[PDB]
Every structure is written in C-alpha cells, then in structure tokens.
Amino acid sequence: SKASVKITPLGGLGEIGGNMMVIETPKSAIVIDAGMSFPKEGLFGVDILIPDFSYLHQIKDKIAGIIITHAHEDHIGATPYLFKELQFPLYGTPLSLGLIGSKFDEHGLKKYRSYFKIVEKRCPISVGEFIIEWIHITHSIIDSSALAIQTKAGTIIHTGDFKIDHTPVDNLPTDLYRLAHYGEKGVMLLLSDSTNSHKSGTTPSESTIAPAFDTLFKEAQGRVIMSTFSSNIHRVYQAIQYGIKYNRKIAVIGRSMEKNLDIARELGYIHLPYQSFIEANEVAKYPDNEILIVTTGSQGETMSALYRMATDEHRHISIKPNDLVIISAKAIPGNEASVSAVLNFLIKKEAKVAYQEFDNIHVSGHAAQEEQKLMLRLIKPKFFLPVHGEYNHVARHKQTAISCGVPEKNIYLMEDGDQVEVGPAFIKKVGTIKSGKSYVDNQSNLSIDTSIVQQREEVASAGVFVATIFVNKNKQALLESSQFSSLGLVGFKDEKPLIKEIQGGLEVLLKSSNAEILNNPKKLEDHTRNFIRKALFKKFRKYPAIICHAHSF
Amino acid sequence: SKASVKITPLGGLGEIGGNMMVIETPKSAIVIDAGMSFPKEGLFGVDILIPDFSYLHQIKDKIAGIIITHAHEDHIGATPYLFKELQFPLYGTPLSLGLIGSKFDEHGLKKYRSYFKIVEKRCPISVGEFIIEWIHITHSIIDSSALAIQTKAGTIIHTGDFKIDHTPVDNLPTDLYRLAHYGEKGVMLLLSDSTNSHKSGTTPSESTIAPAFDTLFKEAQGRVIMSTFSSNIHRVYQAIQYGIKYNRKIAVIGRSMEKNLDIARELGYIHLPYQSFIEANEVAKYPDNEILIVTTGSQGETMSALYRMATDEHRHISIKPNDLVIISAKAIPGNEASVSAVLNFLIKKEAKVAYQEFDNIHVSGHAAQEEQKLMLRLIKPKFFLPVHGEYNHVARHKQTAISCGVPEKNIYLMEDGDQVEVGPAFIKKVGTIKSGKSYVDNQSNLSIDTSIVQQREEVASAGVFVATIFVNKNKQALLESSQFSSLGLVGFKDEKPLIKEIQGGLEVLLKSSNAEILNNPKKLEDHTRNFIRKALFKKFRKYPAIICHAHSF
C-alpha cells in the first residue's frame, strides 16, 4: 500500500547526451529533458541523434509537464522534434525557454511558446503529483539546475550534469545549502552525472582558462580566430571579454551564435557592448592586431567552418599567415583525427594554433570522482541511479558510490528502455519499453529513424548492381538488349566489361529458360537476381544489392 | 657537377603508417618500406590503406631493391600488393623476410620468396649506387633497424620509426656507437620519426609493463584474456611469459598470431615451450585460474574478436563473469568510442577489464622530444627531413630540430608526392608526382582505389531512386506500368506512397511528351531523371542517385 515511483530512461543511459527521463507515479508523470547526442564530428559536419518518443504517446494523459534543467543542446535539442508530435507545458528558467523558443521559431512551432512556464530557483512549484525545486548548480553552460522532486514516496534528487566550481565565471556558485538541507531531511533516490566517472580528483575551475586567454591575447601579433560551436555562450563570452580588453573589434560569424548571444544579452545573463562588434565584411578594414573573429557552423559543428576557412572555400574569412586560431570544439570522444586534419590544413597556411588548453582534459565540465563523492555525501541517498553516460561510466560511478557507503544492492545500472520502480524501501527493474534513436540532419532539420540509415549502409557498404530485361514471352527470347548499371561494387574500368559479361550470361539464360519463368515477370526477376548474385560473388567476393526489372511488353 | 639525390615520399608524410619512400640518384634507385596504414578501427573491423605504386612503374629500370627496416605491417603490409605488379630484390633481416614471405604465401606469391636477400646488421652492403648498413635500434616491435645509406653525394641516415629504450625486453639496446660514428664522419641528410613530436620527455621503457603484467596475473582469480592484433609479437610474448610464470595454459586464437609467433620461434627471436600451449577446444577442460587466452582478429583488428566474444557470437570463447580482459589494441587515434563500446559489452558480462596501462600514453613506441633531440645530436645532420607523420607532426619535429641548432632553411616539410633534391650544399623541392592510397579488404585481400569508394559514398550517403519506363513510341504513351525502387532516401513507410506519387507524375509527363523524346530512349531517360530529381528534391531536400531505364519494345 506504500507509494512508489517508476523511472524510465528514454535517453542518456548508453550515450553521452540525448538525455530524456520519465518519472512516473500512477496517474501522473513528468519528463526531465529532451536532448541531442553528438556521436561523431568530422571535417564536413557532425552526427546528431535524438531519442525515440514512442513511450510518451502511451503515457500522454499522465504527463504534467516537461522539466528543462540545462540551457544547452545536449538537454533541449530534441524539444522541437518532440513538439512536432506531442505538446505539454514546459517548465524552465528564462534562458532555457529563450533558447528553446528560438529553435521552436526556427522550426515553425512559435505557437508552442504558449506552453512555456518560467520558473525561479529556490522556489518549489507543484507540477502534477510532484513538488519540483530548481537548485542552482555550476557547470560549463550559462544556466544549470539540479532538481529536488518531492513525491509521496519520498524526495528524488536529480543532478544529472554538473561540476563543482567554487570560482565560476558568473560568480554564482552551487547552492550547496539547499542540497544539504534535502539530505538532512532525507532523500530516497539520487540520479547523478556519470560522464567523468573514470577521472580522480576535482575538475579545474572555469577561471583557470582566464590566464590562458589573457596570455594568448597579450602576445597575439595578428588576427585572433576563435572556433567553437553555436551553444558555447560562456566560452565565447570569455573570449569576447578578452578581445575587448585588448582593443580588438569582435566579428561573430554564424547566425545561431549571434542569436544565442543576443537571447542571453537581452535576458540579462551576459553584458556585451554593441560598439565592440563589427560585421565580417568589415574585418579587412581593420589592422590585423585589432580583430577577433568568432566562428561557428551548423548545430554542434566546430571544424567544418575551420576547414572551409583553411581551404579558402568559406568566402567570408580566409586564414592568413599571422593568424592565431583557438580551437574549442565539442568534446566528442574520438575526434582526435579530425582535429589533426584541421590542424594540418591550418599549419599549411602558416597559422599558429592553440587547441590543447581548450581540450576536454583541461576542463571536463562534468563532475570528477571527488565532486561525485561530494554530491553523494551532501545528499546521502538511500538508493542511487547513476545517469548521463554509457554502461562503463555508470558502473564506475556505482563503484564510487559503494566506496561512499551506499549498499551495492541499492544501486541499479539502467540502460535505455529499462523501467525501475523505486519505493522508500526497495528498488527493482520491472520491465522494458521501446527505446531508440533517430538521426537528425543539421541542414534540413528533419528526423530519420536509425533503421532507415542502417539499411542505407546495409547496401551503401558494398555496391548496388541494377539490371533490366525485356523479353517476348511468345518467342521465349530476349526482345531488346538487357540494360545494366552499377555503383560502388568495383571501379568502372573493371565493370564496363563485367557489365558485358553478366549481359551475355543473362541473354543465354533467358533463351534457355522455361516459358513459365518468362511468362511471369516476377519469377523472371527472382531468377535473374539469383543468377547475377552468384555471378557477382564469384567475381568480387561481395554481395551487392541487386535490383532487377523484367518486362514482357 | 656535384652529385645529389632525389627523395620521393609515396607514403608516410600525411598519415601515420603506410610508409614508402624512394631514394633516387640518376640511373639508380632504392625503395625504403612498403607499409599499411590503419585510419579507423570499429567493432566490425579496421580500415586499411596501402600506397599507390604508380611512380614505381616510371622508374622500374632504376630500382636496385626494396629495403625493409621493420618487421611489422606498418612497414611490410603493402609488399604483397606491390609484388602483384612489380618485382625487385628484397633486402631484409630474417624475421622481416619471414613475415613478408608468410604474407606472400597467403597471397600466392611464394614464387617471389626467390627475390629475398637476407642481411645482417653492422655490415655495409652494396645495392645499386648505394652502400646500405642496418643499425639495430629499439622500438616496440621484435626487430627494428635504422639505415646508414652512403651515396656519392653524402651519407643519409634513416631512423623512421624508433624509440630509445635502454632496458628493452630482448636486452638488445640501440647500437648507439654506429649512429655516432656516422655523425662524427659527417651526415648530409637525416630522416627521423615525427609521430610523437608533440610529447615532451622520453617514452617509458617496455620494461615498465612487466610489473603491471605481473600484478595483473598475480591477483587474477579466473581466466585471463589478452586481446590484441596479429603483429604484436612482443606484447603477446611478454604476456605468454607471465602466463607460464603463474602456471597458466596458453590458448592462442587466430591463425595469423600463431604463424607469426611460430616464424619468430623458429628463427630464434623468441623462446616458447610447446607444453605450455593448448587448443581452444581444451580451455573448458582446465580450471579458470589456469587459463590464458590470446585473441586476435583479421589483419590489424583487435576489438572485432572482443565484440564477438562479448556478444556470444564467437562460438569458440565466451566471456565469463570472473574473467579479466587485457586490451592492447593498435594505437589508431580516434578509437576511444569503439573501446568504450567493447568496454560496455564486457562490463555487462561482469568481467574486469584492464585497458589504461596498455594504451598509447603509457607506451607510445615512437620517439618523444628528448629521444628526437638525442637522435639529432648523435647524427648532427646538415639537412633534415622529418618523416612518419602528418603535417603538424613533422612541423613540430622541425621546430625541435630548429631548437637543436639546425637552420630553418635546411629543413623541408614534405607531403606525399613532393620530390626533394638534396645535395651536399642545398635542399629544394623540384616537383610533384602522382601519389595516392588504395583501400584494402582484410577478409578478401584485394585492393580498391580510394576513387571507387569515394563514389560508393558519393551516392551511398543520400539514397538511390531506380526507375523503369515502357512506352509505345507510335502511340506516344506509356505501354506498361512504370516500375520503381528506392534505397536509403527515406524509410519505406513514407516511400511506398511517394513511389506512387512519382509514378503518377511520370505517366502524365510521358503522355504529354513530344514524340521525339519518346522516339529516342536516351532523351527520355535524361528527361525522366531530371523530372524525378526535381520531384525528389522538393519532397526530401536530397539529391539521390537517379538511375532510369527506358524501353520502346
């Protein structure tokens, strides 16, 4: 008869990013976050994946609202794509709603800005059968929040994405007293960031970058270029401040970066004088030591713009042999080779490059082991659910929690789809639902399921041999020459004559075929596809997609 | 009238691996190395690239021999593919020729073992107009050699791939006296490893792994699995030694690893007792704490076998919840995400994993800054050509050489294709030749040019809309229903009705077309492809490959 809650991860447990969780009691439910995950970044763009909203359709009538905790694409990137299907009230801080509404406007969903509900921190608010409080927490992004969620089964604490920065840039450190209060009163369950679970110590403060920026700007003798992604408002704000400190005119390239900076300037999060800024067309009018350019690309991209500038295909900015390029790309693990490619192209143009002191190692943004342990000691949860990471990350976080006196039996390692019931005296997995991903094109802004692309590559890897046969069923013979085309199987110079060698085979086969096969085009097409498949495998040791068409006209 | 040489990099300047250089005097030439480059590694295999041998056909009548310096796939992997086109005498140490002949036998080129010529170290040998001496040098692999190449223009020193290890595993440290002698006598040109140019200090000795192995084997309570690639004979030899130290029976999985180990055992490089080894089918007969398994996959692969064992699709070895898995994969930068995937699958099976102390950071294998500086001070070259790396690597190496008192004007940064003439008093680029790569399938063992694959993906990225039209030119109308198929453009559920919507369009178009278009199928096919292209772009914002076929029969 005792109460309980049901935690359903739809994204964030199996990948870094793409966070979406469902906290559900009987007759009520809330959804925490709707994020985008970036698995790879190359010279031509980034891969983007959004979660699958299939389960939300099943519990549509229990959802009391979407809870937004971070004003960043890894937590609000999927909201436009979700609101194309379902709509619920969106609780969030001003900047979070400001950047979500910007994307909504870009997507033609300005209508759903109607659903926005602003919240302030240190102010509990009733949403459904939940009492939610936003608690300020430090992180790399401009606005971050932990959640204190009171339910009749107990209080849940959701940190999710955080670091402990005692000297942040905005001088708004973590509201430590509230986190401790909830812990003294008693906490049933804690969900905590597991991204940086494998690193000991604490993560360095964002203020440890200020001296590096100051040194790089002090001794810069030409233009300064700052390459990053559209949602690094904090880093771009730190860089603009140091540009105006050394009397440099700022030129921001990229419509999304300027919008995001303007949304934050208007809402009062950042202070930026207009007179320090110029347009790209004006950069050539100023001497080189008075120029700071800030470059971004499409959503999540950093190095496509750098590659276009280093190849002279950008057509707005060209790399010059006195330039200093500061690279602050997204921490997409497995990006080193692409950074190396951009670096090669930039060194060819005789440009100095600073990239190490802005990598993921110097600032990780996510809580390291000491910060995770501080969270565990502040909250003192009875049950623990490590979130925001792959399986090995949350496993290491469970190890840390065990070292902090949390019983191993009170920690479950969730995977996307898993459903876990939590009560004031137990924790257990109760089942699985339909979880998945969907690829997203950052240029055309549409979602395509991972199944469609799996197939595109199930064939796009290996070639595709097309064929067309025209026979006269009443003569039982080829009527018009068979026609063929191929792609990706083998280079053309070896397929112009293999095309003639599979044509010969088929002409003979057809003349030698039973009239029934020739009379019914389907049997002929199946017969033909098998003939060709065997012929191509024997010649290439591949099994290309084979498409055949037969005619009897 | 003074002599000079001509250095033509065909591979190794723009990528890590795939090394092939041509040192050419008028009327004579030698080729140093024929390597394989591994740019990416995933859960299903590795990418393999070999250099383009086009220039070697032009200078075929000057080549006095192929010079092999390292017994490893990154220096001898392309030799079978090169010998399918041209043949020259192959100078090499026993193990180098032993592993090259093994691959030759696998490729059906045992005939060309006739071309082998064994060499010993500290023994100058005349090859063409060159006097070549192999000097022992330390490195991660079992046998490595620097080259001292006397020409009438001066003496060239080729280190290429090296580290300075004062306590190697074989107790055969670098022959430092010979390198110094050549330097005192005078050296015109030096080519040196630039792979690890960005790291300060010295690289740790291979003996710093022995305590880690000993600790891991001491406290292993179940089976021990050692996952690596077919050519890590040294690491697999270190691991087998520690397995027999703790009374574990060794089970080697992978035909290539056993062959390479047997080639080295017979030639006397390694000492391995037969009685310590067992077959895979026998591992279940022994208790878990008496079992060391060694796993490899295809050429260069490490984690495909691990993934198959962790998914229970291996069918010879299955991961058990007491296992300890030591990962020693190839240092292919940009592999972190794939290692993380394998790690997730292994932790799901409750297996302990050791991977950090066998990463690239703990042992780099390539000379760091102090070792590069030691080489520069030992050789004292007048001219310097940094090799074995991308552009930023060789640029950093040039910086180091400048700091070592080498004039900036005596250092050139080559790129694949560049031709550089070097004389006893000058250095300059004289032109460019045709350089390139070719992808290699590790299962079927054939080369496919990067052009063929570029195209496979120029279309395999985006979809491919096929179509067939049957018209009667004397009625000027569709005779039989048009037929269509698609792949990768959009999921099927949205293309079954778009296929009907492009069919309708075309039926009308055809009936409305000029008789000339209908009379000549080529014009009809071009007309049709353009119609469809516009229709598909408007619906998908994509430009899929479009293949059309028209019939008038």
Residue numbers in the entry:
A (entry chain A), B (entry chain A): 139 to 691
The authors write:
The H. pylori RNA degradosome is composed of RNase J, a 77.6 kDa enzyme that possesses both 5′−3′ exoribonuclease and endoribonuclease activities, and RhpA, a DEAD-box RNA helicase, with a molecular weight of 55.8 kDa2,7. The central importance of RNase J in post-transcriptional regulation in H. pylori and its participation in an RNase J-based degradosome prompted us to investigate the structure, oligomeric state and post-translational regulation of the H. pylori RNase J. Here, we report the crystal and cryo-EM structures of H. pylori RNase J that assembles in tetramers organized as a dimer-of-dimers. We also show that in vitro and in solution, RNase J is in equilibrium between dimeric and tetrameric states and our data suggest that the tetrameric form constitutes the active form of RNase J in vitro.
The crystal structure was solved at 2.75 Å by molecular replacement using the Streptomyces coelicolor homolog as a search model. One molecule occupies the asymmetric unit of the crystal, and through crystal symmetry a homotetramer can be generated that is organized as a dimer-of-dimers. The core region of the enzyme, residues 137–586, encompasses the beta-CASP and beta-lactamase domains that define this family, but there are no detectable metal cofactors in the map at the catalytic site. An X-ray fluorescent scan also confirmed that there are no detectable Zn ions in the crystal. The CTD, from residues 587 to 691, is poorly ordered in the crystal lattice and the density was not sufficiently well resolved to model the polypeptide. The structure predicted by the Robetta server is in excellent agreement with the X-ray model for the core, with the notable exception of the three loop regions 174–183, 431–441 and 575–586 at the entrance to the active site, for which the predicted loop positions are closer to those seen in the crystal structure of the S. coelicolor RNase J. The electron density over these regions is well defined in the H. pylori map and modeled with high confidence. The obstructions are caused by exposed peptide loop regions that are positioned to accommodate the CTD.
